């Protein structure tokens, strides 16, 4: 394989570390409310302009 004995073994740790971080980030968001509209009285709710749609 011709692997030096230096930086790259550090690099393998770095790669593993980076991937673990990415996965946590991806899964690390709380299953929760982040989509917003946290005003519990919002049955009407039209923030822009007139004429809107919900499916194509």
């Amino acid at each position: 394989m011709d692997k030096k004995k230096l930086l790259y073994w550090v690099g393998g740790g770095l790669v593993l570390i980076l991937i673990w971080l990415w996965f946590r980030n991806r899964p690390a968001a709380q299953v929760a409310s982040n989509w917003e509209g946290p005003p519990y009285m919002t049955y009407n709710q039209p923030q822009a302009g007139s004429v809107t749609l919900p499916v194509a």
Binding site: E36, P38, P39, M41, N44
Partner: protein, 49 residues
């Protein structure tokens, strides 16, 4: 019937009519209608109103 009619010589400031026949004037009736002017579709945000 006590404020709307002023006798000749009396202060007419708060009265509607003044004159010699004032003592015998009276309201047959009065009607009122109150209209309220307001703004609707009270906004709500992430803070609420």
């Amino acid at each position: 019937n006590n404020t709307a009619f002023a006798a000749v010589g009396a202060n007419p400031l708060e009265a509607i009519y003044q004159g010699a026949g004032a003592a015998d004037c009276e309201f047959e009736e009065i009607s009122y209608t109150v209209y309220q002017s307001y703004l609707d579709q009270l906004p709500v945000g992430q803070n609420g109103y």
